[PDB]
Design an enzyme around this catalytic site. Structure first.
Site, mmCIF file in Angstrom:
data_model
loop_
_atom_site.group_PDB
_atom_site.id
_atom_site.type_symbol
_atom_site.label_atom_id
_atom_site.label_comp_id
_atom_site.label_asym_id
_atom_site.label_seq_id
_atom_site.Cartn_x
_atom_site.Cartn_y
_atom_site.Cartn_z
ATOM 1 N N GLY A 7 52.858 18.454 22.358
ATOM 2 C CA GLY A 7 52.409 19.526 21.479
ATOM 3 C C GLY A 7 53.102 19.564 20.129
ATOM 4 O O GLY A 7 53.386 18.527 19.535
ATOM 5 N N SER B 121 54.341 12.617 24.009
ATOM 6 C CA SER B 121 54.661 13.210 22.717
ATOM 7 C C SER B 121 55.980 14.033 22.813
ATOM 8 O O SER B 121 56.968 13.473 23.275
ATOM 9 C CB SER B 121 53.440 13.975 22.184
ATOM 10 O OG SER B 121 53.713 15.021 21.258
ATOM 11 N N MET B 122 55.992 15.334 22.477
ATOM 12 C CA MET B 122 57.195 16.180 22.540
ATOM 13 C C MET B 122 57.746 16.330 23.950
ATOM 14 O O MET B 122 58.943 16.616 24.096
ATOM 15 C CB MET B 122 56.975 17.572 21.891
ATOM 16 C CG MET B 122 57.103 17.593 20.400
ATOM 17 S SD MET B 122 58.648 16.933 19.676
ATOM 18 C CE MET B 122 57.985 15.628 18.926
ATOM 19 N N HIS C 39 54.598 7.895 22.198
ATOM 20 C CA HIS C 39 53.776 8.008 21.003
ATOM 21 C C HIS C 39 53.857 9.421 20.487
ATOM 22 O O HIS C 39 53.649 10.376 21.240
ATOM 23 C CB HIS C 39 52.320 7.661 21.320
ATOM 24 C CG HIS C 39 51.380 7.825 20.170
ATOM 25 N ND1 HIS C 39 51.645 7.267 18.931
ATOM 26 C CD2 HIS C 39 50.194 8.470 20.112
ATOM 27 C CE1 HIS C 39 50.619 7.590 18.164
ATOM 28 N NE2 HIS C 39 49.719 8.313 18.832
ATOM 29 N N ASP D 67 50.196 3.672 20.842
ATOM 30 C CA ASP D 67 49.623 4.284 22.034
ATOM 31 C C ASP D 67 50.111 3.486 23.239
ATOM 32 O O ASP D 67 49.435 2.547 23.657
ATOM 33 C CB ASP D 67 48.092 4.174 21.964
ATOM 34 C CG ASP D 67 47.387 5.249 21.188
ATOM 35 O OD1 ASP D 67 47.992 6.316 20.969
ATOM 36 O OD2 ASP D 67 46.200 5.062 20.873
#
Ligand SMILES: [Cl-]
Ligand SMILES: [Cl-]
Ligand SMILES: [Cl-]
Ligand SMILES: [Cl-]
Ligand SMILES: [Cl-]
Ligand SMILES: [Cl-]
Ligand SMILES: [Cl-]
Lengths: 183, 192, 186, 186, 180, 179, 188, 182, 186, 187, 187
Positions: free
Chosen positions: I61, I90-91, I115, I161
Site C-alpha cells: 500500500g 510492496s510495503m 517490487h 515484478d
C-alpha cells in the site's frame, strides 16, 4: 464533446476515418479491440494499397485484445503507420512498436513505457489464464526483440521493469523510427 | 467509440454487415444470440448463395444462447466462415469449430479453449437449469467429435479440462482448418 | 449491439419488413404491447401473407402472454412459430399456438411446458390475475386442443418441471416439425 | 443546452468548427485531449494555410493530455491563435502561452494561473500518467518551454509555477503569457 | 420537454431569430454555450441586435465574467430581458445589456446581492479573492447603474429583492415592458 | 411514450397547430420551455390565437409569473383549457387566459389555494419580501371579478372546485360541453 | 472517531463531558440537533438547578424554529448557560452564542462570528412548514429585537447587520456585544 | 480494524486516551475538530498539570476546524507535545508547529508540508467562505512566524509554495524541536 | 468473521493483542497505519522489554503509511518479530524485512514480492511527497542495510515484478528463517 | 441469525461459544479476511492448549490460493492436531484444506460433496498480485505435490484430476484418499 | 424487531429460546443459514447429548447443498431433533421437516407443506458450483430415496411429487408420512 462534420453528417472520429485515420485514445479492452479490428478491415476493403494512420494515446490494457489488433495490423495489405501522441504504455507501446518499419512515430513530448504488467485490470478471468499457460509474455518479448533489434535477454529485463522513455529514448531503443519534427 | 460511415449513414458494424461480416465480440447471452441469429437470417434473405464471415473474439457464455447461433448457422443456405481474432473459449470455440468445412480460421496469436464449464454470466434460472442438463453436454461433445474428427472419448476428456490452445494447436486438433498467414502484396499481376 | 441497415432500419426493423417478429426475452406487458403492435401492423400491410414469430423465451406473465395469444388468433395471416434456443412457460404456450402445421423448432431447442404458479415482476393486480385458477384451466384446455393430448395429461404436465428436446416436443404435439439443416437437403 | 444550426444540421460547436474555431472549455483529460488533437488534425487537412482559433476556459488538468495538445499545435502547419475567455490555469495557461507568436489573447476579465500543481492537478491524471511526469522530469520541460515562450528566465518560471499566483489579463500580457488583451471592438 | 420545429429544437429555432435563453444557474458549461451562441450570431450578422432572455438565480463569477466580456467584445448590441428572476451573476448580466435596451417583465424579481459560491470550483473561488473580482463587479455595476461605489458595495453585500419598477429606478434596467 | 409524426414528436406536431401542453409541475425548466414556445408562436403569426392546455398541480410562483407575464406581453390571444387539474399556479394561469377564452373540461378539478411555500430557497425568499401573494390575489380579483377580501380568504383555504363551480367563480368563461 | 471513557462505567467523549455539565453544539442546527440539545439542557437542570452549564458552539447555523427551541430552553431553565464559540458561530449559531448568560459569552481568539440571518433556513435546515411559520409570525423581527437587547446595539443597526454577509473576529464580536470576553490562555 | 482492551473494555484509542494520548490520523473537518477539542478539554479536567501527547498523521483540512484545535491547545493549562508520524501537511503542519516549545517531535521518515492551499470539500459553504478570508491566511502566517521564529516575509513566501520537508529539514525550519532517534 | 473471547469480552484480535500479537492482514493505508502504530505504542506502555509479534498478510500500500509503521517499529524499545503468513508485497515486504534481526520469519508457502510500484493506495498529497523527498532511494537504502544486498541490486529488484518463495526470501536476506512444521519422527 | 450464549455473566455469539470448545467453522469462500480470521483462531487455540485437538468444520466453495495456503501453513505449523470435517461442500481450496487435516482425523458427513478441481484464475476471489504469484511461483505444482502426498495418489493422477471438473461423494473422497472416514450417524 | 431478555445476563429472543434447546429456521436456506443451524445443533449436543432439540420451521426452502448440511448434522448428533412446522415448509424446508426424529415431526393446524424440489438452486439460493454438484452427483435421486424411506411412499410416487407444484395441509402431510402428528391446542 465530439463535434459533427457535414460534407452527410459524421462525428470527428468518423470524418478522420474517411482520411484513413484511426484513434486509439483509451485503455485496450475487447470493445476497443473489436472496433479497431473492424476499422482496419474496413479501410483495407476501401483501398488495399493506401497507408493507414493509427494514432496512439493509450495506457495499455488486455494482452488478448492487443494481440487481436496486432494480428490484424500484420494480416492486412496496407502499411499501418503508428503515431504516439501523449502516451504508449504496456500493450500501447507494443502496438506502437508494431507499426510499418520506417513508419513508427512519436511527438516530442510523448511518453513510452515497455513494462508489460503481470496481470490485467483490463483483462477478464479466462484471459489471464491463457497468458501464463500459452507463455504469451515470451511471445510478446520475442516480437519486441524482432521489432526493436534488441536481444531477447535485454527485452526480458526491460518488460519486467517500471521504465519510462522519452520519444528520443524510444527511437534509440528501436520502438519508433522517428521523433515528429514541428513542420 | 463506434464510428459512422457515409456511402446513407452506418456505424462500423453496420458497414461491415453490408459486406456480409458479423462480429461476435463479447460473452454469449440471449441478447447477443438474438442479434447474431437476426443478422444471419437477414444475410440469407439478401443472398442465399454468397458466403458469410463470422469474426469471433469471445470468452463464451450460455449453452442455450450458443446453440441458437449454432442451429442458425447449420439451418441457413450460405456457408458461414469462422475467424477467431483474439479468443474463442467455451461456446465461443464451439461456434468457431461449427463454421463451414475448410473455412474455419484463426489469426496467429489467437487463443482457443474447448473447456465447456460446469452457469459464466447473468441469465435466467430456467436457462441456467437447461444450460446444465447432462444431455446437452453429450450433444456438444458429439458435435465436436464430428467437426474435429476426434473420438468422443478424447472430446469428453478435453471439454472437461482447463486447456488453452494456440492457433496452430487448434488446427492440429481439427477445431480450425487454417492459421491465417498475412496477405502478401501484389500476388496477382496478370489480373490486377 | 443492434446494427443498422440502409435500403435506415435497425436489424429487427429490417426483419419486420420481411414479416419476421423476434420474441427473444421474458414476456411482460411492454414486450406483449410491442409484439401485439407488430402483429397488428403486419396484418395492415398484408392480411394474406404468413408471419414468422421466432421464439427464444423463458416465458413470463400469463396476462401478457394471453394478449399475444389472442392477437395471433384474431388476425387473418397465419403466424408460423419457430423455437430457436428455448421456449418455457408462456413461451412454449405461444410456440404451440402457431398456425397448424407451421410450428417449428431448431434441433437443439429446449421446450418446457411447465406453467409456474409462482415465478417474474408484474403489477399487484396483474400477479393476482396471473394466479386465477380459471386461467390455468383455459391454458390447459387450449394446450389440449393444440397438441391433441387429453386435458388430464396436460394438467399433469404443466404442473411438472419437465424439459423436452425438439424431437420430444414434436412427439408431444407442441410443434409440427423439427427443422432439418440445409446441408442434409438433396 | 447545446443548440442546433441548419445551413445540414450542426450543434453550436460543430458550426464554430466550420469557421476553424475550437472550444477548450473544460478540465483537460485524455478524452478532451484526443478530441482537441482530432479537431486540430481535421482543420489542417481542410486547409494547411488558414489560421485556427483555440478558445480557452479551463482549470487545467493532465500534463500528459496537455502535452498531446501542445505537441499537435506545434506539429501542424496552420497558426493556432489562443484566446483566454474566463480562466486558464495549470495546463490551460500552458496551452494559452503555446499559441502562435503575436496571436495569444485574453478577454479583459480573464484569470490566468501558471501554478503547475505537483500531481495530476484536480485528479485528472492516472497513476501511470503521474509516474511518468517525475521519472521523465516533465516539470523541467514545462518550465523550459514557458521560459522560451514568455521570455522570462528559467529561475523566475521555476519559482512562479511552484506558487499559487493568479494574474489578470493585463498582468499575463506583462508576464509574456499573452500578446494582447482584447479591446471591445467598434 | 423541449419540442422540435421543421422549417431544430425550440432553443435552436429561437437562435435563428437571434434569441438566446439564459434560463438556469451559471456554470462553465452554460457560459461556454452562451459565449459560443454570441460568437455564432456575430459571425452571421455583425450589425443586427441580439436578444438575451434571463431567468437565472446566478452562479459562478468566472463563468459570468466570460459571458459579460463576450457581450462587450462583440459588434452587435445585446438586449437583456429579465423574465422571472435575475439574481447574483444573473442581475449582473441583466445590467450589462446595451444601454437603453435592458428590460424586465412587470412581475420579474431582481436581486443584486453577490454572495461570498452554490457551485464554483476551489481554484475559481481562490482567483476571485486574490484578483479582488468583487471590487471589479461593484465598479462595473456602479458604471452600469449610475450609483456610487459606496452604495453598490452596501447593496451587493445585502439580501435585497427588487421589483421590475424598483430595478428600473435603481438603474439595473432601462424599461419595464408594458403589455403589447 | 411520446410518438413521432411525419408530414416531429407529438408535442412538436401540436405546436405546429399553435397548441402548448402544460402537463406537469411548474418549475424554471417548464417555465423557460413554455415562455420560448409562446415567443416562437408570436414570431410565426402575431394575430392567430394560441391554445394553452393545462393539467398541472402548480409549482413555483416565480416560474408561474414568468409564464403569466409572457401571456400578457405577447400580441396573440392565449386561450386556456383545463384538462384534468389546475391547482395553485396552474389555476392562476388558467384564470389568466384571454377574456371569454378560458375553458375547462366537465370533470376538471380547480384549486385556487396558493400554498405558503417546487421553488428554490432564493425564489421562496423573493416571494415573501416582494409580497407576491398580494399581487397574485390582486390579479385573481381583477380576472374573476371577485372582491380582494373574498380572494384573500379563498386562496388561504384548501378548496376544490368543479369546472361548473370555477365558471361561477369567474376563473373560467365556459365549461366545454361534448361537441 | 469518538472515544470511550471508563470511570465499571463506560461513556463516549461527549457523555463524559455531559457529566461535567458541558454540551457540544458542533453541527448545523436542525430539529434532531435541537431536540438533543433541549434534552441535555433539561437533564442537567434536573441533576443540579444551581450549577452553571457550558454550551460549546462550532456551528454554521440552521433552522430558526430549531434554534428558537434551544434559545427558549436556555432562558427557561434555572442554571446560567455559558456560551463558548470554538471555530465558528454563524446564523442561529451566533444567535445562540449571544443568548448566553450575562458576562459568560466567550470566543476562542481565532473564532469567526457571522450575524447574517439568511432569508431561508440557513442551507436547507428548515422544512416548508418551518419557512411558512417564520414569515407569518415575523420571527426575523423577534430575532433582531432579541439581538438588539442582548448586544446593546440599536434595532436599526441590527436590522442592517443581520441582512449583510459580514464576518467578525472574536475581538470584533466582543466590541459588537455578541460576546463578553475573548478567552485568555491559562498557563503556570 | 480497531481492537478492544480490558483492564473495563476500551477500544485502542480509548485505551491510549487513558495515558493522555490523542491520535489525529485523518483530514481535519468539524467532526474531527470537535472530537479532538473534547478530548483536550477532558484531559485538562482529569489533570491540569500532566502533559498531553498529540500524534499527527494528517494531510490537513479545514482552516476553521484546524483553528478550533489550535485555540484549544493554546487555551488549556497542560503542555501538548506534538509528534508527527507519517505526514503533517497544511493545517496538519500548522498543528504540529503548535505543540509546546521543546516538545514538538517527528519520526525520521515523516513528511512535512507548510503550503497552506488557497481553497478547501465536504464542508459547508459558509465554512468554505470563511476558510478563504484573506485575514485568516495573514493570521496563520503570523502564528507560523512566532512558532518557528522565521520572519513573516519568509513564512509568506513558503506557505504560498508547494514544498515538502524531511523531519530534519522541519527541525531546521523551526516547525519541530527534535527528530526522534530510534 | 471476528469471534468473541471471555476471560471480560474481547474479539479475536483483541485477545491476541493481550499476548502481544498484532495482525497486519490488509492493504496499507493511513487508517491501517494509525491502528498498527497505536497497537505498537500500547504494547510498549504495557511492557517495554517483552517482544512483540507482527503477523503479515498484505499486498502492500501507501509508502507514507508504511513508513509510519516502519518508524514506530524502530522507535519503540521492544523487539518486533515479523512473520509472513500468505503474502508480503510492496510495503508489506518492506515491513517484513524491518523486523528485529534474527526474528524475521515466513511460513513455507508465503509469497514475497519486493517490487515497490511507482504509484492506488496513496492520496494525491502522499504521491507528491514521495518523488520530491526521494523516498524510493530511502526505501532502497534501508532494504540494502537490512538484507545485506548492495544498493544497485536492491534498485534493480524493487523496480522489477518478482515473486520469491519463503526460501528465496531467506537467501535474499529479507527474512532470517522459514518456519518449519513440527518434525514428528517415530 | 447468529444467537448469543451466556455462561454463568459472560456473553458469546454461537461461533465464539464453539471456539471455547476448540471448534472453528470455515463456512464461506476463502479470501484474506477469512484466512486472517482462521489463522488467528488457530494461533489463539494453540496458546490456550498446545496438546488438545482442534476441530475445523468445512462448508466452502474454495477461493484464493494465497489465502488458502496461509490456513494450510498455520495448520501444519501449530502443535495441536487439526481434525477436518466436511459438512456440505469442499471445493477448490476447501477440498485442499479438508485433505490437509491430521492423518486419521479427516472426515466428511455422508451427503458432503468434494471437488478437487483447482480453477486457473482465483474464480474472481483473488487480486491481480495474488494471481501473478500463482504462475511465477508455480503454486499449482506445489498444490498437486501436497495433494499427491496427502492422498497417496501419483502426481500424474493428481495433475489430471485437479485440471478437471469432477465431483466426488464422501465415500468416493475416502477411496481417493482426501478423507480417512465417512461419519456414520452415531449411537 | 428482535427483543431482549434479561435473566436475574442479556439475550435476544432467539438466544433465550436456544437456552431451552429451541432453534428457529425462519428463512430461505442458504450457506449462512445452514452454517448457523449446524453450529447451533453442534452447540446443543455439547451442552447435553441426551436432551431433545426442537427445530421450528417456517421456510420456503432453498439450497440442496445447504439443506443436506443441516440434514446430515441432524442425523449425526446424539440428541433427537423434533421438527415443528409453523407457517410453511417448502422445498428443502419440507425435506428437513420429514427428517426429524421418528414420532417427533409436527405441524400446526394451518401450516402449508410443499414437497416440490425446483430444478435449479431453488429460489436462486444456490451457486453455479452448487448447481453443478447436484446434477453430477445425482443428489435429486438421493433426496427422493431419503424422502421415500422417511414417508413410506414408493420411490415412483416421491419422484413424481418432488417434480410437481403441489401443496398439502397439515393433515394431508400427516397422511403422506411427512409429519407424525398435527398439533392440537394445549389444554
Ligand atoms: Cl511533479
Ligand atoms: Cl453598452
Ligand atoms: Cl468574494
Ligand atoms: Cl508554548
Ligand atoms: Cl516513486
Ligand atoms: Cl494456475
Ligand atoms: Cl436436478
Amino acid at each position: 464533446l465530439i463535434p459533427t462534420v457535414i460534407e452527410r453528417a459524421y462525428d470527428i472520429y468518423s470524418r478522420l476515418l474517411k482520411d484513413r485515420i484511426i484513434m486509439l485514445g483509451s485503455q485496450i479492452d475487447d470493445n476497443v479491440a473489436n472496433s479497431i479490428v473492424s476499422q482496419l478491415l474496413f479501410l483495407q476493403a476501401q483501398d488495399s494499397e493506401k497507408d493507414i494512420y493509427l494514432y496512439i494515446n493509450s495506457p495499455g490494457g488486455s494482452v488478448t485484445a492487443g494481440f487481436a489488433i496486432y494480428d490484424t495490423i500484420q494480416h492486412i495489405k496496407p502499411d499501418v503507420q503508428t503515431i504516439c501522441i501523449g502516451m504508449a504504455a504496456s500493450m500501447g507501446s507494443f502496438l506502437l512498436a508494431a507499426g510499418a518499419k520506417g513508419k513508427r512515430f512519436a511527438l516530442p513530448n510523448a511518453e513510452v513505457m515497455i513494462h508489460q504488467p503481470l496481470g490485467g485490470a483490463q483483462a477478464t478471468e479466462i484471459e489471464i489464464a491463457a497468458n501464463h499457460i500459452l507463455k504469451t509474455r515470451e511471445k510478446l518479448n520475442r516480437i519486441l526483440s524482432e521489432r526493436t533489434g534488441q536481444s531477447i535477454e535485454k527485452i526480458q529485463k526491460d518488460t519486467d521493469r517500471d521504465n519510462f522513455l522519452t520519444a528520443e529514448e524510444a527511437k534509440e531503443y528501436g520502438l519508433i523510427d522517428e521523433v515528429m519534427v514541428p513542420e
